[PDB]
Design a binder for these strands. Sequence first.
RNA 1: UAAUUGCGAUAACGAACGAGACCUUAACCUACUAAAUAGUGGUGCUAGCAUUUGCUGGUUAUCCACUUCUUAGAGGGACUAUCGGUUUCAAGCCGAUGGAAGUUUGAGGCAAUAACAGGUCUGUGAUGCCCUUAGACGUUCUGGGCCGCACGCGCGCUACACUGACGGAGCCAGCGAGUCUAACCUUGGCCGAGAGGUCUUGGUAAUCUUGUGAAACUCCGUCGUGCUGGGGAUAGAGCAUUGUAAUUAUUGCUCUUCAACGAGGAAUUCCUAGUAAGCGCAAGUCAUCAGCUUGCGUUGAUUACGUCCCUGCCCUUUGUACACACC
Lengths: 67, 70, 137, 63, 49, 143, 100, 199, 145
Amino acid sequence: GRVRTKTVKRASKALIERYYPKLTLDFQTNKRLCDEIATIQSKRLRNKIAGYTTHLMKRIQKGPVRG
Amino acid sequence: AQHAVILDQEKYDRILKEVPTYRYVSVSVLVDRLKIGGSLARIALRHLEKEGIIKPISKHSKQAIYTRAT
Amino acid sequence: VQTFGKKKSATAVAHVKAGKGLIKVNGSPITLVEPEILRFKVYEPLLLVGLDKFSNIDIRVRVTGGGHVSQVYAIRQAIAKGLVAYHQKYVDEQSKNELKKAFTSYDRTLLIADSRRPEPKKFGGKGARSRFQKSYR
Amino acid sequence: TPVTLAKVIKVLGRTGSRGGVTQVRVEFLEDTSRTIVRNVKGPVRENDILVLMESEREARRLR
Amino acid sequence: FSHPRRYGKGSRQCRVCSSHTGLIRKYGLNICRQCFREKANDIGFNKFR
Amino acid sequence: PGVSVRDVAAQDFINAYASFLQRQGKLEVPGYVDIVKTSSGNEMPPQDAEGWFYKRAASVARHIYMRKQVGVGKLNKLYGGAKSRGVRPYKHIDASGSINRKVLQALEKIGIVEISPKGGRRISENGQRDLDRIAAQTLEEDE
Amino acid sequence: IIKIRITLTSTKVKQLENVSSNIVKNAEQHNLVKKGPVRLPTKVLKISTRKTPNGEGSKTWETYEMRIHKRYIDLEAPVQIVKRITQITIEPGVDVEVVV
Amino acid sequence: FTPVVLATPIPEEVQQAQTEIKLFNKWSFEEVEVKDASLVDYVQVRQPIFVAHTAGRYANKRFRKAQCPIIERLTNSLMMNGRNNGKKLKAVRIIKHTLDIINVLTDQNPIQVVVDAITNTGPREDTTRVRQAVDVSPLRRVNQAIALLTIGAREAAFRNIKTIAETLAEELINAAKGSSTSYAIKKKDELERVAKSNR
Amino acid sequence: SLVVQEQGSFQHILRLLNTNVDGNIKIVYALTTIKGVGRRYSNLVCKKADVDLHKRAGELTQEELERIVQIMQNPTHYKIPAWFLNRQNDITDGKDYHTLANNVESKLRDDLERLKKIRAHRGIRHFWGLRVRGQHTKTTGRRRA
RNA sequence: UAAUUGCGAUAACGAACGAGACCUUAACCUACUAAAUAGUGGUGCUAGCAUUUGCUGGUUAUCCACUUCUUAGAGGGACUAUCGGUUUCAAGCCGAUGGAAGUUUGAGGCAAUAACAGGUCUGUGAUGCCCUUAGACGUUCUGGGCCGCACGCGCGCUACACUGACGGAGCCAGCGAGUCUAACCUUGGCCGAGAGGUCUUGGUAAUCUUGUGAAACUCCGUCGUGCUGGGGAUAGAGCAUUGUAAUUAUUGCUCUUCAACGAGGAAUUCCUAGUAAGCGCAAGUCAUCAGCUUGCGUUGAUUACGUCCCUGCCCUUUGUACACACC
Ligand SMILES: [Mg+2]
Ligand SMILES: [Mg+2]
Ligand SMILES: [Zn+2]
């Protein structure tokens, strides 16, 4: 399966919580900004965080998300 | 050596009037239809190909596909 | 101008240059690939696009590293990639796309190398997954 | 040997002890306004055509 | 008081424990297969895959 | 129109050069024929005793044409196959060294191959001439 | 000036690359001619052994690895530069052989 | 038609591949149609192929086998008996010989003959352990028809003078004509015989 | 291939060196039925006899058969090497023999008998019927009947 | 969800380990760096065939240029992306497109808490206790044994053949190893039928062995369905190699003998894609000895994309007269 662990989900949630006037709904710029605003210790994990952040902001524009 | 070993000539007219009733000719066809043994089927096919009624379909080894003359 | 094709470990490097329709595989013509049953696998990247189609290009391949079938597939991918690369670099992008359409629509790994590689063998049995026969009493 | 063909419109689910049989809702090609439930051994998906010897046998789950 | 020991299992021993059995002679370690497991990290042999 | 040995691949050229070496009459045969198996990993001698040495010589000449210098050990490895060791698994066994060495010496005496400065036998100028003539003749006789 | 070749061998990739970059930098700072550092491929000195010290249990095998990476860098330099380049690279873990 | 040449001469028997209606170098693919309506989309002709040796991925998904050429499926099923695992060149040569023999005997487009044999020997109703009479899906029908044909050819050619190619040819011909002398037809008839006795 | 009429001039299973030889088999493998000659030895003697190996043992001739017999009984004389023989420097006269008769069994019995008469370990193993070439007797060759 | 993976729910809140993350490797990158220890082209020198100048070959200090192949550093790349559908509101899932790669991308390495009277005192100069310690249970030398054969069992090798055996011919790998106190990997020449011998040579190794010219495989022929030219057990004779020493044959080679075995009872093992299976190769043990193992590559299926029927596992509920825990 492709369930994201809490290490990914909580970090993506925090990234949105303090970087909303920031990285758009595109994964490329999301990961590029993650590189600058987060010290993730592997490119694999950074890509996971960026993809989940992209998905979360993509579903944010359809209404607020709990949490 | 059980059958059709070296002679196959007591009915040698079966090398001329064998064409009817079958368009397919092969080593095992010669062995099976009570005419020629596999020990010389490979040379009887070469004989009939060089002069005779059979036409080759391909030059395959371990196989032989022959047809009647059209 | 320089392209390559791989199937498992066989790499075929093809040089496509300006010439007059000369297709060599190992110094011999493409009529001489000698699986004697997959010789049409190496004709396929020609008969698809254009039968002659060529008084302008010369393809010279060199293949090493795999097996007979793997080398056949490697060269058949290499010359197709070389033709596509030559059309992209020199002739035009429209023609490159138009014959890439035929190659990929009939694709037998003509343009994309097969990603299947031998999976490593593990202890406790011959082969990657096959295990030694287990007994209980 | 009467000829009667049908097309599975829905796959109900796996059945049998080992789960080897798929139970499917099938709709006849002739008289398309009628559906019967059948059991199939092999792999079958939707928009697939079954040939059935006997046309009316409401299949149930196999224990 | 001695008979030839120029070859075979009696010619060489583990450089650590002096055992004649289970010896690893690859690259000239001459170390028993168990002593090699004990001090493989020191020699520089690591596990990756 | 510029035809080399690499225009007829595997069997037509080999059989035609074996036929040419047969008809030339120069035999160079060591008298080992009818007696030898061509490899310790074989079970029987060559089926046609008259001509197997000529096919071997043709094959060796073509093999030295297609690449650089080739030696007796390389020929032994090339011509050796798997050996049926009975109830033991098969394994590659080198072919007969004497047969390959005498084939090399025979082609040397004929002038088809020469000794290499780096070892082994490299095809000679007359060797290339004869092989190219045979290749062109085979191509012009049968496609 | 003399033809020299420096052969660097190590299991520590970071130390090896640091020494190679040091040599390259010391060559370019004096504007010498050099054939770039050629990377002789990693020799993986694989060793397969049995995990148990006895003959009991599931037959579990265990492979240890020793990666030997090699570099070679050949250039032209006088005796002074040769001696200072052999005496500038003493990084712990890299074996350095200078041949003329 | 368009007999142009180039530096390396490749013969017109090859140059006639695509100037007219596409075909395999001996057998056309457009004049092939399955005699039924259920085995459509599971017997794969058209696309055509120059040889039944597409070294392609066909097992990583469930129904991708239906897109594999049916001639290649027959070749793969011939690629069996353990001693002949692998030897795909041997199996494709056997298939070539079989196609030639089919064309010799009542030519009938040997590819079409193969398709007809598969469609005739696909068992429509079988029995499952619960036995209970269940239907057979088209993919399993094709798979079982190919397995039965190949197995019949295999054990007919085992220990007898006729080769695997001609035993396969006879099996395919008899199955396509639907005669009860083919092993696959007999086995399918047995499977459908105990289909009605287990309803 | 040619005329093989030969109404009465073909030999079915025949007699050669007190051994029945099938005339329906190619000459070499038909000859391999004699105790003491195998595939390679029969092939060599048939090529030394200048006989066509492509024909069956029953039609070749009535005199080249005796030529093959003479060559077979005298291998070292007809340009056949000593290493091709099954009996080299046998035990008592050093000459190179090839026991090809219902006499290879006799020579084998003589070798076994001399071994057990001198009470050599091989002879004792042969007398007990056990394996003689150091084979493990624990698991194989049990029933033998 | 593969997951105590998450969405959530909520007398729990916030945490730790394990899972995941991670590391190694296998996939791609006409992107950078850089390569007579890797390679490819344009000129040189240069044999052949063809002569408007082409084809294939040679030129390990013969010229220049480059890095596609190769190598390995620094990096990029996938994050289930995009698009639909389905999702209790979500975690997710299912298809298609794009992609080198969409199953945790494939394979591993690492891997919790509790345990077992699991194995190892015969790995250890790890060891407590007991025994022995000079006619020793220390140690060494010779010889034998560990292999011994009415029989039973486990892992395997070879087969029962024509989808084949045998002969020629074609002539494609990858993982690796190798000697300076010295005999290791051995090219090449020569002799030998073979095994092998001998005279040199290269290599302390991307340099040479080695392109490990592997085997299955492919082509063309012989065999012709018979225990046959399938099969190669048993045995006899000879020739060598390793070793101080081959007898109870170390092994290799030649000729001869040519057993069972005609696809195997009840039972029973492993396995889902470059996998099964077939095929050989290198390494380990190694003076010599693979039918073993560890890896490697060559050829490469069928079937399934499920289930809890069998054998078990995890969570919950439930019953227990079990606690050595249904043996
Ligand atoms: Mg023991
Ligand atoms: Mg009880
Ligand atoms: Zn030790």
